[PDB]
Design a protein around this ligand. Structure first.
Ligand SMILES: Nc1ncnc2c1ncn2[C@@H]1O[C@H](COP(=O)(O)OP(=O)(O)OP(=O)(O)O)[C@@H](O)[C@H]1O
Ligand SMILES: Nc1ncnc2c1ncn2[C@@H]1O[C@H](COP(=O)(O)OP(=O)(O)OP(=O)(O)O)[C@@H](O)[C@H]1O
Ligand SMILES: Nc1ncnc2c1ncn2[C@@H]1O[C@H](COP(=O)(O)OP(=O)(O)OP(=O)(O)O)[C@@H](O)[C@H]1O
Ligand SMILES: Nc1ncnc2c1ncn2[C@@H]1O[C@H](COP(=O)(O)OP(=O)(O)OP(=O)(O)O)[C@@H](O)[C@H]1O
Ligand SMILES: Nc1ncnc2c1ncn2[C@@H]1O[C@H](COP(=O)(O)OP(=O)(O)OP(=O)(O)O)[C@@H](O)[C@H]1O
Lengths: 362, 362, 362, 362, 362
DNA sequence: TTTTTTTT
């Protein structure tokens, strides 16, 4: 009596499993009677307890199979195929819509019955970020627009200033909010090439700490990143398809994603300055350090650097119409939950404390 | 019963699907009821809704097979094999009739019953393009007819210029018309020594931001590309078929295609100048800016860099003589529409709006 | 009759074996008569003598199989798939309890009656360690927390002190305790690429004896590791994911582990100094050397380097509540076993002997 | 009722096809009815229409095969094995026989129906070259059979005479006639080894101007290269095998190819001239360059540079009995196919004009 | 009937044949009748003639098989599998005990009836080596024990002396006796990575002729090696695990083997001298030289190079009780053989002859 | 067979 490969593939679709080993490992767990399944009884992993009962019968047969890896290979290929179909057909708006659904699914789990996330801690993060710069949530919408529109030769925002001024914290939150990857340009010119190959089929990329020259003027270590980025003008323009690469692999050719670049305050040629649509300078604020010192759950749980903290900020501050028709359904049930559990007085007390440099919770 | 690999390959042929994962995914969609199919109901994707009903039955049999990737591989290979036999045996003129049939089949969709964009906008593009430089449209025909009739030096162009001067947009439009690839050769000798190999069965090639070591009198970003391209004489000359590099796949030796160099305003040795049909020496013009600033619909839709933007100009300016007889059936019939949809006052008014720096539309 | 692949997969899981040849070679041993198996009779290897009697029947048929390596490969994949599942789903604290349970299992054999250690010698090692620094056991707890919490920019401790002052000894013990890798960054920048690849999915890392520059007056040889560390800030900070690499294998994206830097008495740029959480100064002290030269079994058995000794220190010193919940049952039993076998007076006698520089035992 | 693997191999042998995708692509076309096959109707391509009618029956069965690429791989293997077996046996005349045919095949297209080569201006170059130096058809015939005989010590030619005396041009033209490559010597000795490796299995090789010391006062670039050359007594005299080397690969040994050294009016130690069959001195003579200045089409169409111009000279001067014994038939076809076009008188007309310095044609 | 894969695997185990091709070739020789087989008849190779008659029947079927290399692969895998088990499980004493059995098996053949060696001449080897240093036999026993215990710090021995003073001769015999590798550390610092890579999994290592600074003060050449050893302290002390690399392979980690260092009499940095357990001085001695002139058979048969000679010395000189217990039975038989073959009278005259510098034998 | 090594 044979294995249903169809049931296996369906699990890999429903749980969007990218890895043969991950798929293999988790399907094996279903061989034990879900009846007795300690993990299900303790509700610890949705990708398991949502499925164990349905897949149990098939898993017992799969446990005996001699073909196992081949069964998994066909499954993962199907998920990969689905991604390429999507990537070659979705609008960037629809792509962003899908990412928001993924994050909302995580939020529903985080604050769910399992409930491990304290939404009080998470909302403190929103206050801190809204405090960091003026008009914060409006600036986020402007970033989201230009990432969606992907307007050629107006594609990159420059984050600049002194150290410990939060630029990477915001960048990491933005990069979790979208999809994307960090990349490092501060490399010898031969090394860059498999490296920039990583950007294949990503939605954002972030370049870090790109080293200027003559920086000792500023007590900055001079280095390559800026002079390398000069040679990348074609990629930054996004004005025509570039070629990308991997080991043992042929190239793929595509427009290069949009993104963000971070800078200690080196000088830059204006020939390059022309190629950024916008620039933001970050500057230190004594009271924020005090606040974090009092409130280290903000750091220890990484809340301030999470895309989930940005998403909550947007849900709080933006109109419902700023979200696509499909997700407005879920935006509705989230806006109410925040309000139902943070009266404006609560958030005011928080945002007050942040500005005061007081420990946020009291 | 059992999968018809024949029907698979017929889909792959008729959709020209070169990609095994793309093909795998696309064909798997057909497993569901076409009579239900929401994509067919939307008429969302041509390469779906044309075919779903026909392949539905075969896809259900495919949906349970265990050979799935192997089935796709054979089918895809006939696509490549056809493409390569065709590449070898067809005249470059016949190739253009093929390429032009392709673009017409897209235009057939773009202004199909969906009216998915308004042709007024694309024609505002034609005005914004043709107005750029003397006799603009004619240059397209001259360039194209060089790309068929290959001759030494009479194979390559310099698009020299300053910042913000259209050369890239021109080039991008030309490539999206013709089919081909772009390249960077500011990148070093070894990278160049592989990347020259991109030319397999391509009709045309273009080069990007190519910087020469001089030009600090114009403070240019400066580099090796001048020396490299100068040194890349066989590829330039095309006087014999040359090796084209590949990784883990069959390399080949072919006539190196014709193409264009874009470069900034470097100093150039007169011998290095003595290599072309012609230089085109790009310059800025003021009205363009103000037009676009109003006409911002152009760029989210990427009209002015599209290939089909050119073809509308070409249709606009050229006599019916300027086309092959097989396409003349389509071309003439299609050329009718422009009068139905534009009195010439429209085009006049648009180009005047362009000239006056207004939003092109009124 | 036929081979049970399932029993092989069980054995691989039960022994947690990863190497296909180790698994193969092991399984083959069961083919001989269990009732005459000299290894079983001699009770030498538990991974043999627990299992031969059970597996014997299937091992005879395996010994005849024409397919032996494919059977083993599927079994190894099952074990590796478990590691993958764990790496994604477990918390850092859970990983640490798994490691502790494995070490506790290793301890239970060594100090079993069928074991081979002397618990008095292994306890003697603890006395030497608790003299090596002030409040040694508290420092271990504070370090363990630091690695479990993994707080960005607060992730690395610096060990410095003259040569022959125990820093490498202590790192090797913590490294065995947690699992991890040592790394050497006194390299040219190219090879350093693959060297940092070794960190992949490790819990800790230890950078070994990085070399500063200048200080021939310090009488330290100069090198370049510290200039390299100053580049690698991003890897220390753990703020954002980064891409690791292996020979002939694709780039792997993860956040980089927390860890330790060890260093002789070089000067350190304030930048790197600001980037370490804590600095521990080791010093050479005579009575340790004199005691150690009288207590050489401490060296001979590697007692002083080995993580088992640190775990024993925590069991002795720390409250039971400081251990994760489920292991408290086992930890309580070990505390009782230690108390059964050592008075406080024995431990006090040992520490006083160490202070006197006499041999620890008396 | 089954695919004959045999017939597929035959077609691969007759096409001498070395590519599995091409062979796949080609053979699939035979599946349609040969009876109406429009390529068979149009008769554009004999490599199709010769075969379709025979293969059609088998091609239908092939088009239904699920194994197609495997059939085709075996077919290409056969042709590669065939070429390898043959390649191990060649006389140098069989080499020259094979390498001749390429030019004829190309001419059969260049001046064929595609006809993009003007045979007149091509023959104008042939006439032009005739007066560069004495009796050049015999000079080349004497040179060339020496390259077949390859008799030790009797294998190398030296060009002398001042800048702009034509030696670079004629050398490169002969290199085109022959294949092979040229090499430098003007390097510190270690560099030479991999460059010498280029000679591996070349039919012929060349050496560029030797930067001869004993050129200083002559104001020629001057230094080691002549003394470097003097150290390679062995290779040139070509009695015995020698080692050769390449980047990233192990050594090989061969009898080094025969060849040419090309030089200006330097010094020469007798030690080196002792190694030569023939000195030739080159004179700049004004009617040559001034005719070219009056005939510069030769430069653009690369005519005099071309190896086909050299073979054309031989074809038109030399007696049929001198060419490769069987191919003489084909040579007579080409002679006839040219004789009808050009008399001695028109060729002599050209010769008069060049000798007078007048532009070649009238 | 069919190939028994088991009988092949049994041959591979008993010949300990590690290489698939060697296993393949060996087994095919059994095709022919052992009854006539000249290799059997002449007793040329025990790995043949001990086995031909048993394996003959299976070899006949093997020679018709179509799977031949597959059978060899699984057979060889069994051999490798046995090593991997043994490497991780055995004690250093058992490893040496196994190594002794192998050498004794050779001696059983070598001094057998077919045995081509003279036990008399090989006993001259023992006489010469027992002359080379005071208490030679005791030195060997202490060295071996030191390797077996592998006590950290106390791991390494230093040989010093003039050229042609014997240090390499003794290193070579020790290295054969134990198994191990010779390494060169006079390299530049970069290449050292792969050189140390050779130490992977060895039992001993020998470092060859490490050159010091400034030994030109007594005509010695000079180089890096001593400075490099002043780097690698932990490799010598052997307290801590270290990473090791091979070309194209990911690093592995282990304790670095114990071993020997050899040098001419440079000065030694006392940092390095503190590493070594013991220094042995080699000094040239005329009577050894003069005796060696008249005992050429020692050199010509490489007697004094070989581990076999040392094992004979240990058998003669050490008590039976002094070996690991499983070997002691064989020792008694070899003791009995040797005491029959020589009176103390004869042996002591030979030592006297070496002191005479006369030929050993009379 | 590339990529790693080797080349540099
Ligand atoms: N505006 C600010 N004023 C004061 N402290 C700040 C500010 N922004 C961030 N911080 C502190 O700086 C720490 C580091 O933040 P972050 O990494 O985002 O800074 P950065 O300037 O982007 O640094 P880098 O260039 O090193 O990546 C934060 O954890 C926070 O404690
Ligand atoms: N002729 C022009 N005059 C003024 N601005 C222009 C002109 N052509 C292009 N630009 C500006 O440059 C933008 C990018 O166009 P494009 O890439 O074609 O120009 P380019 O000269 O090739 O650019 P680059 O200097 O980056 O190579 C346009 O959207 C427009 O804003
Ligand atoms: N505090 C100490 N006082 C005296 N001797 C010490 C002390 N710590 C270590 N030792 C001695 O130093 C030896 C080497 O220890 P270890 O390798 O850990 O030292 P280290 O200073 O960290 O060395 P390195 O800097 O070379 O890594 C120990 O085996 C012991 O003999
Ligand atoms: N026989 C000739 N008579 C007159 N001019 C000549 C002759 N041959 C070559 N030229 C001139 O010499 C120029 C360079 O030709 P070529 O490189 O073949 O000569 P060369 O003697 O090898 O030169 P050089 O030693 O300077 O590199 C030609 O462009 C032409 O102007
Ligand atoms: N102690 C000795 N007295 C005299 N001659 C010796 C002595 N040892 C070796 N020889 C002679 O020197 C030759 C080389 O011996 P060996 O290679 O062991 O010397 P070495 O000093 O270790 O050399 P190297 O330092 O070059 O490795 C021997 O074959 C023998 O002829």
């Amino acid at each position: 009596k044979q294995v249903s490969w169809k049931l296996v593939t369906e699990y890999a679709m429903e749980t969007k499993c990218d890895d043969v080993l991950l798929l293999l490992g988790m399907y094996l767990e279903f061989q034990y009677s879900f009846e007795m399944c300690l993990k299900c009884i303790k509700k610890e992993q949705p990708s398991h307890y949502k499925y164990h009962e349905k897949h149990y019968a098939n898993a017992a047969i799969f446990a005996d199979s001699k073909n196992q890896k081949t069964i998994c290979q066909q499954a993962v290929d199907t998920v990969l195929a689905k991604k390429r179909v999507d990537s070659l057909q979705l609008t960037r708006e629809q792509m962003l819509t899908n990412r928001f659904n993924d994050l909302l699914d995580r939020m529903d789990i985080m604050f769910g019955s399992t409930g491990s996330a304290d939404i009080e801690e998470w909302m403190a993060g929103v206050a801190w970020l809204h405090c960091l710069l003026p008009k914060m949530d409006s600036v986020v919408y402007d970033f989201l627009k230009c990432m969606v529109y992907n307007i050629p030769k107006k594609r990159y925002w420059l984050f600049k200033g002194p150290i410990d001024s939060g630029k990477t914290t915001l960048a990491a939150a933005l990069l979790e909010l979208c999809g994307g990857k960090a990349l490092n340009v501060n490399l010898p010119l031969d090394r860059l090439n498999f490296e920039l190959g990583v950007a294949i089929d990503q939605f954002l990329v972030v370049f870090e700490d790109v080293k200027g020259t003559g920086g000792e003027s500023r007590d900055l270590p001079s280095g390559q990143g800026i002079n390398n980025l000069d040679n990348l003008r074609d990629y930054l323009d996004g004005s025509v398809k570039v070629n990308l690469e991997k080991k043992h692999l042929n190239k793929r050719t595509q427009i290069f994603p949009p993104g963000i670049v971070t800078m200690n305050e080196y000088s830059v040629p204006k020939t390059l300055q022309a190629r950024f649509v916008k620039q933001i300078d970050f500057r230190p604020k004594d009271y924020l350090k005090h606040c974090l010192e009092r409130s280290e759950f903000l750091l220890e749980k990484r809340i301030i650097q999470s895309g989930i903290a940005l998403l909550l900020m947007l849900i709080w501050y933006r109109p419902v119409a700023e979200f696509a028709q499909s997700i407005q359904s879920r935006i509705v049930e989230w806006k109410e939950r925040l309000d139902k559990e943070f009266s404006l007085s609560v958030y005011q007390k928080m945002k007050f404390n942040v500005a005061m440099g007081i420990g946020v919770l009291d």
